[PDB]
Design a protein around this ligand. Structure first.
Ligand SMILES: Nc1ncnc2c1ncn2[C@@H]1O[C@H](COP(=O)(O)OP(=O)(O)O)[C@@H](O)[C@H]1O
Ligand SMILES: Nc1ncnc2c1ncn2[C@@H]1O[C@H](COP(=O)(O)OP(=O)(O)O)[C@@H](O)[C@H]1O
Ligand SMILES: Nc1ncnc2c1ncn2[C@@H]1O[C@H](COP(=O)(O)OP(=O)(O)O)[C@@H](O)[C@H]1O
Ligand SMILES: Nc1ncnc2c1ncn2[C@@H]1O[C@H](COP(=O)(O)OP(=O)(O)O)[C@@H](O)[C@H]1O
Lengths: 235, 235, 235, 235
């Protein structure tokens, strides 16, 4: 019956915002490698929505060149007059982006070319801004250090989020007005399976729409039917 | 609680500024080869901010041609009407840059092509200006002298900065208002590990943000937790 | 303490042998598509060991041509003088294999080329022998019928084995001298997870070697530690 | 003064032999991913020296094809008449190796091609033998499962050895006749640094040769000078 809230502040959200503002004021590189679906991508957008001098792209592996990725960052900076060459684009980024005290956020940092991440790190370095890397744990695996040596020299704050915590789903249940202890344990058990935030949010939205269609309150059995869907135990 | 200082004058900063002004008034070549993250890059920018007729580029290995690097120096000179050919660009640099009594600073001089550094040395020579090389100790290793013979004849003041000194981190503690002798020894021990200035700055900024978030003073335990992060003993 | 038995007769083994002898006497094609690790590959070898005029290859996708696969069947027939051309090999198979009333078994029938399975079906047809296909459920998916039309007309007895049964693991516990009902339920729960026969056999062999190294009987806790290994809930 | 012993039974050696004999009797695949220099390679050779029906290759990335690697295994089987084609070699391995109840050991399993490890797993499977994979933790990273899906279904006993234990270096000190508790703590501290078994063995051999050249007993100061060598804190 109430409106579903899309985003909730969580222990991971608190942690990752402190890491984000750390790389902001620190003006240095923060790598966030974690399990898939730990909710990192969404929080970054909440940081972008709440804070000034913040930018974010995503990297599809289609846009995984230096040219394409810097073009993406340039259009995110609003310079629609960006040149299609590498060089003058790099110069335009260097003139535009330095002195703003900003924070660049990059998602899926595993698909970075060495020249790609190289130009990014030398950019923020030659720009006095923030760069923050996201994605899975292949990002730190791509460094483990003569090709990534000076880059490993400046990793300010890595923060690994493997899975959720109990206060994480507890604040989730607080935001979704969930009071059952059986409900809380079931939410925790759902959080034990991967795609944690995504599956939990899906399960929450299935139960909310089912209880709204039946005119009832979200309860434990709606959550059981929701989790009984999705083919999680079906190969 | 106070504002963090962005830059601190240091014994290396004193040394390297004297080398920088030496190559300036001397109008000759100074190679600064050191360990990675000795803080040389940052000081160069303080020299650029404090002094007139000073320019600086960075060299990504993307921009490692003669054409690209001279284009970078040209846009740093503000000649946005620079030609995309090598020749007329070299002529425009020769007319623009001679007679100003300036100082060109070049970072990461290890990725120089022989024609690249060749055109740079013949430039400053035919320009009555200063050139200063930065980077790791591969720059002097690329010369050790019939291809680099007259260039090794040019060299005015090499200054090797391997690691920090104790007065270095002492002036750091003076700038960061640090009075603990246990704190001073811990800062020195952090300076013994590579990425010296970078890790120390990271550690200083971690402790400052943690003590500001907890409302307290930066103390030894915040420094221990900061250094306990970053995976320095983790492979 | 007793000798571990490598193979046990099972409800799937009974079913699949009846399908195998059916395609034998019927001299027609039987496709066995199932989930991975349903134990089909091993049983086929028990059929090969117990029965005369039985042959079996495996198909690695390295050997997935008509030439390579028929060469494999030829060396399985013991004709080491087989020609390296397609044609005379096909003739040698046609002369050797017809009149023996045999049964060809082919594993991993999903990696069949259309010409590959085409030559196989026209072989057995022009040979008065048996062909039996194995593998996952992509084999029937590759037919779902103008390129596979007459082949879908040959189909004699498909038998899909998705997962195990309770009498399956019951005869497993009879062969492994397992009498605990808690043990039986735990074996069933292990059979609910994929790689059923393989994981169960691994678990049985872990518990047997652990109880033999500790001088004890296989019990429930050894099975729990065995299943606690293998990273089944670890991504 | 006594003879140095090269190999000592250790907790990792006990663990890894139990995993090795497990994959032997189990006739299934055991992946041993660990940190570099955890001493796994040597123990494998002790298993090869002590046990019958055991074979081992190494994989240089020069020999990283299916053809080259199977050729290596064939020459390890003593069939010097092995064919230089893939197919008849695979057939010769299939006829030679099945029925012996053997154990193949493969080192550096990270450099496996998909067809390479594919032919190996289908080999042991079509051979009723043992395969055991070694190397760093990139082997399990290359699987994390539709290209490696049935292979991840094969996996019997992974054993990760990150670093040593205290009983490990304790049995080392027992084999090397080391009784000092200061000596024991120093050996443990050396074991905390990577290249554990190798550096410790190097340190042991430096101290043994120095004390033999000086006519004395190995003591703590010889160990300190040995560890003071090797440039472990020098970049
Ligand atoms: N605080 C939150 N509240 C609700 N859903 C969240 C929250 N944080 C993340 N999510 C969910 O996580 C997903 C977005 O991030 P996600 O895709 O998990 O990132 P990544 O795949 O990079 O780990 C969506 O399902 C989103 O609803
Ligand atoms: N005087 C200084 N005060 C504060 N930080 C400094 C100072 N000198 C260097 N740094 C730090 O060093 C880095 C910039 O130079 P650096 O990257 O170490 O140069 P290089 O890699 O070429 O040796 C940044 O982390 C910067 O904060
Ligand atoms: N009757 C049986 N008794 C014991 N183990 C069996 C039995 N049948 C199959 N297995 C096990 O199953 C595997 C053989 O079949 P498998 O290769 O899994 O078939 P597929 O992967 O083609 O479905 C081996 O692990 C083997 O030990
Ligand atoms: N039991 C042991 N006692 C002494 N040294 C050992 C022992 N086991 C292994 N080593 C040492 O380990 C090395 C051989 O294995 P290693 O190179 O560490 O394997 P990997 O590189 O695959 O981890 C040699 O330095 C060898 O002396």
């Amino acid at each position: 019956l109430p409106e579903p809230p899309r985003f909730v502040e969580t222990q991971t959200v608190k942690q990752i915002w402190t890491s984000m503002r750390f790389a902001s004021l620190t003006e240095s590189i923060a790598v966030v490698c974690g399990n898939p679906g730990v909710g990192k991508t969404e929080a970054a957008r909440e940081y972008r929505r709440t804070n000034n001098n913040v930018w974010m792209i995503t990297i599809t592996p289609s846009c995984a060149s230096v040219l394409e990725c810097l073009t993406e960052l340039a259009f995110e900076l609003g310079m629609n007059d960006a040149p299609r060459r590498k060089g003058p684009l790099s110069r335009a980024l260097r003139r535009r982006l330095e002195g703003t005290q900003g924070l660049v956020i990059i998602d899926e940092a595993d698909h970075l070319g060495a020249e790609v991440l190289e130009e990014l790190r030398l950019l923020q370095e030659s720009t006095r801004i923030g760069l923050v890397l996201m994605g899975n744990h292949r990002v730190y695996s791509n460094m483990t250090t003569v090709e990534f040596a000076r880059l490993f020299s400046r990793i300010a704050k890595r923060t690994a989020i493997n899975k959720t915590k109990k206060a994480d789903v507890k604040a989730i249940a607080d935001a979704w007005q969930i009071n059952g202890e059986k409900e809380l344990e079931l939410l925790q058990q759902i959080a034990q399976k991967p795609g944690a935030l995504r599956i939990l949010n899906h399960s929450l939205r299935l139960a909310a729409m089912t209880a709204h269609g039946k005119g009832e309150r979200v309860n434990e059995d709606y959550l059981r039917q929701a989790f009984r869907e999705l083919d999680l135990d079906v190969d």
